[PDB]
């Protein structure tokens, strides 16, 4: 409401969006009942396919404090190449600012083969 | 952290700490100390009302329970070609190193002295100085 509160809301949204990215990273990496996650299994199949699905994998999460992150993962091959070493996966995590439809969006891209970060960005965005 | 999985976690943690640093700096700017404006507020209030204000950075740090550190720098400047407090914008820079590295996450938020409205915001992973 106030500009003072708007600042705090922007910061909380940045924090929640980042928490969503961490949640996604864990969902990707952490085994479930001793075997890869369904999300990892999907990207493993895509990474080893010469014409992979590019359908986003979408989820939403409510944290303990009631803040919400809307999360999407997707991948694409470097243009003109195939193979897992040329497959890069992007996590997008969005969280709306309280009392607003503006949102903070965190976008991190990592390589399937190395798990190294290729790019990272984060921005306050106006409402869709 | 040297594995790439840990590096990603360390990047996220440095982003958390930098963001929390900005939040604490905001509170330090705004919150009264003994019924009187904070010392950092009084300094920018003086600057905002000067035709040639000091552009000296004001430095602080915040150490968190997990042991991470945010280094804070605040400063201000008048909009080029303009004067007065309505045209005085203050920038908070908040840095935190990634664990096991001198690479860092830097959060930079600029707000207007008069309105307290956000004028710009950015954040980046940075290579070591
Ligand atoms: Cl790894």
Author numbering:
A (entry chain B): 12 to 139
B (entry chain C): 11 to 139
Provide the authors' own sentences about this structure as they appear in the paper.
PilE1/PilE2 are the major pilins forming the backbone of the filament, while the three minor pilins (PilA, PilB, and PilC) form a tip-located complex promoting adhesion to various host receptors.
Although it has a typical pilin size—17 kDa for the processed protein—PilA is an unusual pilin. After optimizing the best diffracting crystals and using protein produced in the presence of seleno-methionine (SeMet) for phase determination, we solved a 1.77-Å resolution structure. A closer inspection of the crystal packing showed that PilA forms head-to-toe dimers, stabilized by a series of hydrogen bonds between residues in α1-helix and the last two β-strands of the β-sheet (β4 and β5). Critically, since I interacts with J and K, this suggested to us that PilA might be interacting with another minor pilin (PilB and/or PilC) to form a complex capping S. sanguinis T4P. Using isothermal titration calorimetry (ITC), we showed that PilA has high affinity for PilC, with a dissociation constant (KD) of 23.8 ± 7.9 nM. PilA thus acts as an intrapilus chaperone, protecting PilC from proteolysis by perhaps participating in its folding.
